[PDB]
DNA sequence: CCGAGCAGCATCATTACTTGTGAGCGGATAAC
DNA sequence: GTTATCCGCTCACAATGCCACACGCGCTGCTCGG
């Protein structure tokens, strides 16, 4: 993953039960923005037609 | 339209009437042109056109020409939809049997013919010969035969002897069977017959025949000759990217069977070699069997995939059949799914919503608002606009959902709250924000738990969702009237930190002119958030109804509490905010706010509480660092001590000075003591670790540590976890459950040695596996529950009865667990409750006992209240309002319609996930009451217990019993009665390994029938030298004294049997086996002395086996009728035993396994139901012996015990309705005036209405007996069947309802849900009563 | 993912399942029980008949709501017709009572 | 502007009858547009009906008698019109 | 000739530790 | 022997919900076919 500078404190309940609050910086630095590669296969059968 | 579902067999005529042709060829589709083949499983001619209003041959393509068949391919021209209903039929070349009526135990054919199912099986499959019509020779109409027998009778006779085999044999055999003749014949023969099981079989078969003749079915229909085939639509042949088609199993089975049929017919015309046609008929029977059911008689697994083919029955039964897959719960189409987050800025009734999901859902409402606004007067342009997301669409959506509620739903909806409503708001991202409190309601964590959404669209539905399932209307859990919306964590911490008191903090000692003043002071940083100060506050008060006095008092508080006071809504007195304000305190605050100020101020108060809690928690900065959880320094020492302790204990064993088991126990005990000491050390070093100073030397205040600010606040986790963290972790469990010698000396702030972590892993994995299984088990249990009670709906308003159950404050041998006020709260009393000022009517008999009533009750300290159950209500098909008592989740009495059955089943099944898988000492003062005892004094002036069910009670001076015990038999009583004694002052002691034969008159003792060697042996105390007679009973000894038994005599100063003083009967004592007797001849006796010292689950499965009411292993034999005990002819395999009532007739002799011991001697005299042999009790016996009130109190006690053990609470109403459901059937005692048979089980409600109507007339009612069935069976034997069809079996219930013609009127939640109409429970109750009052004449 | 209206299974005119198929949600047994625990009569009613069944009913609903009218036309769950036809595939005659 | 339904159910001593009557009223107030009694505030017909209910001027008997009075007005107006038309045959 | 479709198959032993419970049936076991 | 009694054995029948995702689903020597 990533080593993140993190503090342990409630924050207006935005981390109420276990939800995790982050900083737009972690997005601007792309610290977690990942990739996903997916394939699509178009086949060409040979119908009797 | 309709109001009932008729069901019965179908004549071949009927089946053929359903048909639209006779498919002949198995082939489905031409491949060179993908067209349905003529005379095939998709033949357009036989089913319908493949394309709408388009002939197959292309001769017509116009809607006008609809209705004319073609002439080049011959197919009707309609919409393609008709290919969904046209059923086909197959002419079976030979008759054949229907597997269902033939194998579903019990075989309907077998019962119909009084024939062994083995025989009918062996004759269907062509292996034997059944002779029919029984000609003049020695042959029968029903006898089976074999090959050699067959041809031997043939050589004996070529006629008057009709032996056949296979289907047509069965057909002709049924067809000539005179039904009503056999019926009345067996009828007149029934009362003639008296052998029990014969009578039972007779009445079963006679009921079958009577239902048959009453139904329209005819026996020959039970053998198919034409076979209907499903429409082509419902068994589709969907292709793939190429010529690959998903050949549904139905098509393949149909291909197989039609192939067999064609082949067999072609053989029939072709000269028919006999053995070949025989075997082919057998094979065709097998094939049609497999088609109707791939299950029985073997397997017909598909090719290339070693797994069975989907039978027709498969498409019905199981979790995949249409019932549990598309009828009951169907995949909805209209709304959404996502994962959730918190977003606490929003009010309690609101909820988040992603803009994308919103835009996708209300798309129809979007089009509507756009068209009505004319900005897009064509649906196409509407789609374009919503595809381009021009801001116009955005604010249009914002307007269109301004009040439009929606439904948030957890995945497993355990109880009623699992689905709730909210007014949505628009946010970004893809998550679903929601208020925190309600996420605690769902048991919805934020670990990635996904929630579904559901928009209600029709106006009635939207207004409904606003009225009922909006969160702001569900604060009291319907299970227990406790508030379900409780601030759980991360907000309780905030307040608890705020409402605390640091001794010398910045600002202590000031005086504040109001809460707003102190708030301004704190925000400007001029004073701490918690320092003692003096503030003036005007706690508004509702003295009389409607008024509001305002006392501007001057209270000493903390600025924290001063600030928090700004939220209470002019109600509650200040005294509710002045304390530390823990979690339980918050629940208390919310509850009293709700009770005093209605509802709306309370929801506002809760919202404000959550807001301010989050705010001041963030302002706090509560944070857990490693140095917070301070280790108690002395712990080490303690360990060593205990360690050194166990060390020398090992010496105690290494020197053999102590036994091994006591050594183990001693290790356990010293470790437990050291654990408690180290826990108290950790606490005492944590809870008050802070030491500070106020303008002076020093003070000791409660600790401000981060830990114990979460624990003591009750925020998250209790001390049972802290002491596990800081202090010693303690012992851990072996896989079996044993305890390891050496506990985990370590802790968590310190590391763990490998082995320590290993044992911790043992424990944790056990727990995890327990949860992982109990989840599914509890799911199945709660499903059975909701099924067996899916019909109870409060319909009448007052049954107008008087039978109630005696609700009493429960006592368990310790202190009172559930006070009477906790149980009887909110339930209408049965009869007038007398003030214990006897002949003072405290409360009348139709009073909804609410809180002020229960307080007026407990004031006068009543004993127990006869109260209206639900099992005692009298209304037919549903229970009356007043019997069900106070509706929970609200305050009013129940309203007519609440499907209390379902809410009760849910409330019971939900907490299932929280389940698992010598002396008697008084405790307080008061009298010493004794029940069921015949007290005779001893020579030692004490009292002797001389019965079997002697109950000790300790009552208080105020009249309520505080303690109770079961004082065993023969235990001496060292205490009188009314003796006000303190705790621990013993009343009775005894030894469990004895069972004396205490007398009731003094004098000497004599022997009678005391024979040495034959019936008794001579055994000595070889370790002291003493001697004794060992009475071995019949079997143990030689048979020459088996039939003979001994009798000891309580003789007077002479040697003559004396009569019981008080009556006119002798008293000599038979002593059982192993009776080790010492009393010599003619020796003085003590009054009540030991003549002979005769030597002597848990989790969810417990409640499961309870509700199933299954016979517990080794049940406690009870007493059917009273009398004197005497074992009959001994050792009939079992040990027989007759008991003769004082004068009641004793035609019964119960046989108890002599292996199993016994709890009653011979010369004993006790009434019915007494424990003849100790052990668990079968609830059936409880019912059938001591009524229904006894068994229902027993069940409620049992299950409430199992739930209290886990601390969860369930109001007794729920288990109460469940027990009312599991016994609604009754078995008939006599014939009665009407036509109710003997062994005919029938709905006790229907028996009640029949007896009611008859006793209204001149006749006399029919005598019944309340039966009892496990929830499963009690659900299957339901009046309606479609319910019981859907529920669990759906292959017996269908067959039975079919053979009996069970016309099913719905009147049930299950059906009305299935068929797709309204529900009798909710507003649908109003609709149905308006239907029955007007639309039903 | 969400679903306003779209594809429908062939064997039963119920919507498909799965984000891949743009399908709806499975309103299963326990959701039904939770609903009927409240009143929830009309809600459950329309959800069973007109939301995701009764092709004529749901088409009428869509066409009626776009005209700014919220009213249900509960007909018959097509899956129930399926069940009837499937039972009738066996000798088990099953009809609808006249009244 | 409605969040709760407490006083609403206080007006009709039943929840289900409450929602049913309110639903009928709102449906009338959407299709065949009647007059929203309480002044609306850009509010759906649902909350409008619930507010009318809590005001106390709408319930089962009141709604039914208003409907029946309007229906008898329709009766008398239809009678007048059709008799005037039968006179127009002269 | 040789590729493409096709028609009814236990494809020998294809085995198969329990899951827990209930009901029924063939046959041991005892009373009249 | 009868007659019913009960018992060992056999067989049927139940197994949380969702989801999501992935993967896969006749053949084979007869039939046909040119
Ligand atoms: Mg979770
Ligand atoms: Zn044609
Ligand atoms: Zn009643």
Swiss-Prot record, chain C:
Family membership noted in the UniProt record: Belongs to the RNA polymerase beta chain family.
Function: DNA-dependent RNA polymerase catalyzes the transcription of DNA into RNA using the four ribonucleoside triphosphates as substrates.
Quaternary assembly: The RNAP catalytic core consists of 2 alpha, 1 beta, 1 beta' and 1 omega subunit. When a sigma factor is associated with the core the holoenzyme is formed, which can initiate transcription.
Protein name: DNA-directed RNA polymerase subunit beta
Gene coding for it: rpoB
Swiss-Prot record, chain D:
Cited SUPFAM superfamilies: RPB6/omega subunit-like
EC number(s) given by UniProt: 2.7.7.6
Swiss-Prot/TrEMBL keywords: DNA-directed RNA polymerase, Nucleotidyltransferase, Transcription, Transferase
Catalytic reaction list: RNA(n) + a ribonucleoside 5'-triphosphate = RNA(n+1) + diphosphate
Membrane-spanning residues: none
GO-annotated cellular components: cytosol; cytosolic DNA-directed RNA polymerase complex; RNA polymerase complex; transcription elongation factor complex
Keyword Transcription belongs to the record: yes
Listed Gene3D superfamilies: 3.90.940.10
GO biological process terms on file: bacterial-type flagellum assembly; bacterial-type flagellum-dependent cell motility; cell motility; cellular response to cell envelope stress; DNA-templated transcription initiation; intracellular iron ion homeostasis; nitrate assimilation; protein-containing complex assembly
Gene Ontology MF annotations: bacterial-type RNA polymerase core enzyme binding; DNA binding; DNA-directed RNA polymerase activity
Function: Promotes RNA polymerase (RNAP) assembly. Latches the N- and C-terminal regions of the beta' subunit thereby facilitating its interaction with the beta and alpha subunits.
Family in the record: Belongs to the RNA polymerase subunit omega family.
Subunit and interaction comment: The RNAP catalytic core consists of 2 alpha, 1 beta, 1 beta' and 1 omega subunit. When a sigma factor is associated with the core the holoenzyme is formed, which can initiate transcription. The rRNA transcription and antitermination complex (rrnTAC) consists of RNAP, NusA, NusB, NusE (rpsJ), NusG, SubB, ribosomal protein S4, DNA and precursor rRNA; S4 is more flexible than other subunits.
Designated name of the protein: DNA-directed RNA polymerase subunit omega
Organism: Escherichia coli (strain K12)
Upper lineage: Bacteria, Pseudomonadati, Pseudomonadota, Gammaproteobacteria, Enterobacterales
Gene assigned in the entry: rpoZ
């Amino acid at each position: 993953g990533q080593n993140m500078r993190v503090a342990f404190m409630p924050w207006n309940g935005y981390n109420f039960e276990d939800s995790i609050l982050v900083s737009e910086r972690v997005v601007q630095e792309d610290r977690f923005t990942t990739i996903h590669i997916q394939e699509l296969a178009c086949v060409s059968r040979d119908t009797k037609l | 339209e309709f109001d009932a579902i008729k069901i019965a067999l179908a004549s071949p005529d009927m089946i053929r009437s359903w048909s639209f042709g006779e498919v002949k060829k198995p082939e489905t589709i031409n491949y060179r042109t993908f067209k349905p083949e003529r005379d095939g499983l998709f033949c357009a001619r036989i089913f319908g056109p493949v394309k709408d209003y388009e002939c197959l041959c292309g001769k017509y393509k116009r809607l006008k020409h609809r209705g004319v068949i073609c002439e080049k391919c011959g197919v009707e021209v309609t919409q393609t939809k008709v290919r969904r209903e046209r059923m086909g039929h197959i002419e079976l070349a030979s008759p054949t049997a229907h597997i269902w009526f033939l194998k579903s135990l019990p075989s309907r054919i077998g019962l119909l013919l009084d024939m062994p199912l083995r025989d009918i099986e062996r004759v269907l499959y062509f292996e034997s010969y059944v002779v029919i019509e029984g000609g003049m020779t020695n042959l029968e109409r029903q006898q089976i035969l074999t090959e050699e027998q067959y041809l031997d009778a043939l050589e004996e006779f070529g006629d008057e002897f009709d032996a056949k085999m296979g289907a047509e044999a069965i057909q002709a055999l049924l067809k000539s069977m005179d039904l009503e003749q056999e019926c009345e014949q067996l009828r007149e023969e029934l009362n003639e017959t008296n052998s029990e099981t014969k009578r039972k079989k007779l009445t079963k078969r006679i009921k079958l025949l009577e239902a048959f003749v009453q139904s329209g079915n005819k026996p020959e229909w039970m053998i198919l000759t034409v076979l209907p085939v499903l429409p082509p639509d419902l068994r589709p042949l969907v292709p793939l990217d190429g010529g690959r088609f998903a050949t549904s199993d139905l098509n393949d089975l149909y291909r197989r069977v039609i192939n067999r049929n064609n082949r067999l017919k072609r053989l029939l015309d072709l000269a028919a070699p006999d053995i070949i046609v025989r075997n082919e008929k057998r094979m065709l029977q097998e094939a049609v069997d497999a088609l109707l059911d791939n299950g029985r008689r073997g397997r017909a697994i598909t090719g290339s995939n070693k797994r069975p083919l989907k039978s027709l029955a498969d498409m019905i039964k199981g979790k995949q059949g249409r019932f549990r897959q598309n009828l009951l719960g169907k995949r909805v189409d209209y709304s959404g799914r996502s994962v959730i987050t918190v977003g606490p800025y929003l009010r309690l009734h609101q909820c988040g919503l992603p803009k994308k999901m919103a835009l996708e859902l209300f798309k129809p409402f979007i089009y509507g608002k756009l068209e009505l606004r004319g900005l897009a007067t064509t649906i196409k342009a509407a789609k374009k606009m919503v595809e381009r997301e021009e801001a116009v669409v955005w604010d249009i959506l914002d307007e269109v959902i301004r009040e439009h509620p929606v439904l948030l739903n957890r995945a497993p909806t355990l109880h009623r709250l699992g689905i709730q409503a909210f007014e949505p708001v628009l946010i970004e991202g893809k998550a679903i924000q929601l208020h925190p409190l309600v996420c605690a309601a769902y048991n919805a964590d934020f670990d990635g738990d996904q929630m579904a959404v559901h928009v209600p669209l029709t106006l009635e539905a939207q207004l409904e969702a606003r009225a009922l399932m909006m969160s702001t209307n569900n604060i009291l859990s319907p299970a227990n009237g406790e508030p379900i919306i409780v601030p759980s964590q991360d907000v309780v911490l905030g307040l608890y930190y705020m409402t605390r008191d640091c001794v010398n903090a910045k600002g202590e000692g000031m005086v504040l002119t109001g809460p707003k003043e102190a708030e301004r002071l704190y925000r400007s940083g001029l004073a701490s958030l918690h320092a003692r100060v003096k503030v003036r506050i005007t706690e508004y008060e509702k003295d009389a109804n409607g008024e509001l006095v305002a006392k501007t008092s001057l209270k000493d508080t903390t600025v924290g509490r001063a600030i928090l006071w700004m939220i209470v809504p002019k109600g509650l007195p200040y005294s509710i905010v002045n304390q530390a304000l823990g979690k339980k305190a918050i629940s208390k605050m919310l509850n009293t706010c709700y009770r005093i100020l209605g509802l709306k101020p309370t929801v506002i108060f809760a919202d404000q509480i959550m807001y301010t809690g989050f705010a001041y928690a963030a302002r706090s900065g509560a944070s857990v660092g490693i140095d917070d959880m301070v280790i108690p320094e002395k712990k080490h020492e303690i360990i060593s001590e205990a360690e050194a302790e166990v060390a020398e204990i090992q010496e105690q064993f290494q020197s053999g000075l102590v036994t091994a088991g006591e050594r183990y126990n001693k290790v356990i005990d010293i470790w437990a003591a050291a654990n408690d000491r180290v826990s108290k050390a950790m606490m005492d070093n944590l809870q008050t670790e802070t030491v500070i100073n106020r303008d002076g030397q020093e003070e000791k205040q409660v600790s401000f540590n981060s830990i114990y600010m979460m624990a003591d606040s009750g925020a998250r986790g209790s001390a049972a976890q802290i002491r596990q963290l800081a202090g010693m972790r303690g012992l851990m469990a072996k896989p079996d459950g044993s305890i390891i010698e050496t506990p985990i000396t370590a802790n968590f702030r310190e590391g763990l040695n490998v082995l320590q972590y290993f044992i911790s892993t043992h424990g944790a994995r056990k727990g995890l596996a327990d949860t992982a299984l109990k989840t599914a088990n509890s799911g199945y249990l709660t499903r059975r529950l909701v099924d067996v009670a899916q019909d109870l709906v409060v319909t009448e308003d007052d049954c107008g009865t008087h039978e109630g159950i005696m609700m009493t404050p429960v006592i368990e041998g310790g202190d009172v667990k559930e006070p009477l006020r906790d149980r009887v709260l909110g339930r209408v009393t049965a009869e007038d409750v007398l003030k214990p000022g006897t002949a003072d009517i405290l409360v009348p008999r139709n009073t909804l006992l609410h809180e002020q009533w229960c307080d007026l009750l407990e004031e006068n300290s009543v004993d127990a209240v006869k109260v209206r159950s639900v099992v005692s209500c009298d209304t037919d098909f549903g229970v009356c309002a007043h019997c069900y008592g106070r509706d929970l989740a609200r305050g009013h009495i129940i309203n007519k319609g609440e499907a209390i059955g379902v809410i009760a089943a849910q409330s019971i099944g939900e907490p299932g996930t929280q389940l698992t898988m010598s002396s008697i000492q008084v405790k307080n003062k008061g009298s010493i009451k004794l029940s069921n005892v015949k007290s005779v004094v001893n020579s030692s002036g004490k009292l002797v217990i001389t019965s079997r069910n002697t109950e000790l009670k300790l009552i208080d001076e105020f009249g309520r019993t505080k303690e109770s015990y079961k004082v065993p038999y023969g235990a001496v009583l060292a205490k009188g009665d009314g003796e006000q004694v303190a705790g621990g002052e013993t009343v009775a002691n005894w030894d469990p390994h004895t069972m004396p034969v205490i007398t009731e008159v003094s004098g000497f003792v004599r022997f009678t029938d005391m024979i040495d060697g034959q019936t008794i042996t001579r055994q000595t105390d070889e370790l002291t030298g003493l001697s004794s007679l060992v009475v071995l009973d019949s079997a143990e000894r030689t048979a020459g004294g088996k039939d003979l038994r001994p009798a000891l005599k309580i003789v007077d100063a002479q040697g003559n049997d004396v009569l019981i003083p008080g009556t006119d009967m002798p008293a000599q004592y038979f002593l059982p086996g192993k009776a080790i007797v010492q009393l010599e001849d003619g020796v003085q006796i003590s009054s009540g002395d030991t003549l002979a010292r005769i030597p002597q689950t848990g989790g969810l499965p417990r409640v499961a086996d309870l509700f199933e009411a299954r016979r517990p292993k080794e049940p406690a034999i009870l007493a059917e009728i009273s009398g004197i005990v005497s074992f009959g002819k001994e050792t009939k395999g079992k040990r027989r035993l007759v008991i003769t009532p004082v004068d009641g007739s004793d035609p019964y002799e119960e046989m108890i396994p002599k292996w199993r011991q016994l709890n009653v001697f011979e010369g004993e005299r006790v009434e019915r139901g007494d424990v003849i042999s100790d052990g668990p009790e079968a609830p059936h016996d409880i019912l059938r012996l001591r009524g229904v009130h006894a068994v229902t109190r027993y069940i409620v006690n049992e299950v409430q015990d199992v739930y209290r053990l886990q601390g969860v609470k369930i109001n007794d109403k729920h288990i109460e309705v469940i027990v009312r459901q599991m016994l609604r059937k009754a078995t008939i005692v006599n014939a009665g005036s009407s036509d109710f048979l003997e062994g005919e089980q029938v709905e006790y409600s229907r028996v009640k209405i029949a007896n009611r109507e008859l006793e209204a007339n001149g006749k006399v009612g029919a005598t019944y007996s309340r039966d009892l069935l496990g929830i499963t069976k009690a659900s299957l034997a339901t009046e309606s069947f479609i319910s019981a069809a859907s529920f669990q079996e759906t292959t017996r219930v269908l067959t039975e309802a079919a053979v009996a013609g069970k016309r099913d009127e719905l009147r049930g939640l299950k059906e009305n849900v299935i068929v797709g109409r309204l529900i009798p429970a909710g507003t649908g109750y109003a609709y149905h009563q308006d239907r029955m009052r007007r639309r039903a004449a | 993912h969400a679903r306003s209206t779209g594809s429908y299974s062939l064997v039963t005119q119920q919507p498909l399942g799965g984000k891949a198929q743009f399908g709806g949600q499975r309103f299963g047994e326990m959701e039904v029980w939770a609903l009927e625990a409240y009143g929830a009569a009309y809600t459950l009613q329309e959800m069973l008949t007109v939301k995701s069944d009764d092709v004529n009913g749901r088409t009428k609903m869509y066409k009626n709501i776009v005209d700014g009218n919220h009213q249900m036309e509960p007909g018959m769950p097509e899956s129930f017709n399926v069940l009837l036809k499937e039972i009738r595939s066996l000798g088990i005659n099953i009809e609808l009572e006249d009244e | 502007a409605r969040v709760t339904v407490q006083d609403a159910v206080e007006k009709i001593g039943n929840r289900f009858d409450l929602v049913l009557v309110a639903a009928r009223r709102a449906r009338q107030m959407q299709v065949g547009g009647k007059d929203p009694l309480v002044p609306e505030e850009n509010d759906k017909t649902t909350v409008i009906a619930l507010r009318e209910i809590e005001e106390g001027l709408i319930n089962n008997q009141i709604l039914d008698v208003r409907e029946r009075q309007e229906q008898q007005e329709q009766e008398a107006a239809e009678l007048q019109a059709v008799t005037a038309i039968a006179e127009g045959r002269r």
